[PDB]
Amino acid sequence: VKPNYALKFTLAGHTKAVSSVKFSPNGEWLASSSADKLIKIWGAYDGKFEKTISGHKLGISDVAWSSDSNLLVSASDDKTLKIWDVSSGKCLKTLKGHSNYVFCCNFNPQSNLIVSGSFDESVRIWDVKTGKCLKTLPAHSDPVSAVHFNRDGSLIVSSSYDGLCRIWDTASGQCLKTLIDDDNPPVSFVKFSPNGKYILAATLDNTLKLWDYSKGKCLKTYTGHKNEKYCIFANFSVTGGKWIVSGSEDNLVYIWNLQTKEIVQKLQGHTDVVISTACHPTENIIASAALENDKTIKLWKSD
Numbered sequence: 001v002k003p004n005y006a007l008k009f010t011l012a013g014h015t016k017a018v019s020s021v022k023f024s025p026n027g028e029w030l031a032s033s034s035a036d037k038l039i040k041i042w043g044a045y046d047g048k049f050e051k052t053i054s055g056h057k058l059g060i061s062d063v064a065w066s067s068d069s070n071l072l073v074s075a076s077d078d079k080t081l082k083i084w085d086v087s088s089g090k091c092l093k094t095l096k097g098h099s100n101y102v103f104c105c106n107f108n109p110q111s112n113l114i115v116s117g118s119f120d121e122s123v124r125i126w127d128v129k130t131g132k133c134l135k136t137l138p139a140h141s142d143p144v145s146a147v148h149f150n151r152d153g154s155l156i157v158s159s160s161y162d163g164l165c166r167i168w169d170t171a172s173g174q175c176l177k178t179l180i181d182d183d184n185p186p187v188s189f190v191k192f193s194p195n196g197k198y199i200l201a202a203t204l205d206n207t208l209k210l211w212d213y214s215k216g217k218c219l220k221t222y223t224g225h226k227n228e229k230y231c232i233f234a235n236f237s238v239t240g241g242k243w244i245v246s247g248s249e250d251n252l253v254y255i256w257n258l259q260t261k262e263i264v265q266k267l268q269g270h271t272d273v274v275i276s277t278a279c280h281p282t283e284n285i286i287a288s289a290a291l292e293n294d295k296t297i298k299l300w301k302s303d
């Protein structure tokens with residue numbers, strides 16, 4: 001069993017490197033952030049441009065959706081996060097507190113909290129309603145590349161250039177686990193699996209790893225792509241077959257059979273590093289995005 005992803009739409013508009021792409025949970029929209037200090041909203045099924053959201057003073061590294069698809073959270077080099085009401089385009093809150101670039105962000109499933117990570121080596125937990133910082137965790141000894149909440153929001157997974165993945169108790173802020181393989185390459189990305197038993201981590205030694213968090217064991221390894229420098233997102237594709245999807249420094253989208261770990265498809269088309277990919281929550285759609293030499297988002301579909 002192999003998928004058949006084929007290019008359907010190319011989305012131009014960003015004037016600088018695209019940093020992240022995310023589909024709304026309701027499946028209606030695609031959000032993109034860029035080094036151009038802007039967030040763009042696109043139609044998930046046709047790639048039709050909807051709107052631009054601006055206000056950040058420097059490049060945006062990440063964007064994330066709230067569970068009801070009404071809010072966006074963005075992380076910027078202007079050392080803030082911003083909470084946006086998508087429909088009205090308004091900036092609800094500006095989260096000030098990090099001392100360096102904010103590199104990653106996410107909402108919890110209940111979307112009353114925001115987790116953020118920064119070049120200041122900390123993980124912060126914010127109140128969505130007030131925009132106040134509830135906890136500052138002295139999480140790592142190098143920049144925090146990714147942060148993500150589990151299925152019920154009781155755990156936060158963080159990764160850093162220091163070579164570690166750490167699991168934090170949302171309520172106490174105590175470190176529950178430190179995950180590392182025998183090698184120490186910088187960990188550029190991490191995320192909990194859709195149902196939360198696993199963690200998918202990306203290292204800067206051209207490797208994707210699937211860990212069983214509880215047992216502290218690496219269960220699967222996915223190789224064949226190139227990733228020695230950039231914080232490339234990776235994803236679980238679960239609408240058709242069960243796959244692992246990731247961008248690559250060789251300008252391709254790689255797709256792996258999750259169980260067998262073999263490459264099932266490679267998507268050719270971008271002219272620069274595929275920095276980010278996203279999988280549609282209900283349809284076999286992959287959104288992919290590239291750096292400065294390309295500046296486009298591509299929408300691929302499988303039948």
Ligand SMILES: C[C@H](O[C@@H](Cc1ccc(-c2cccc(Cl)c2)cc1)C(=O)Nc1nnn[nH]1)C(=O)O
Binds near residue numbers: 194197198219236258
């Ligand atoms: C179905 C979809 O996602 C799945 C993705 C998945 C699928 C399979 C394996 C896995 C792990 C170890 C060995 C092997 Cl042979 C497979 C790992 C992840 C998921 O989240 N499973 C999940 N999370 N927590 N507990 N079960 C969804 O939940 O919509």
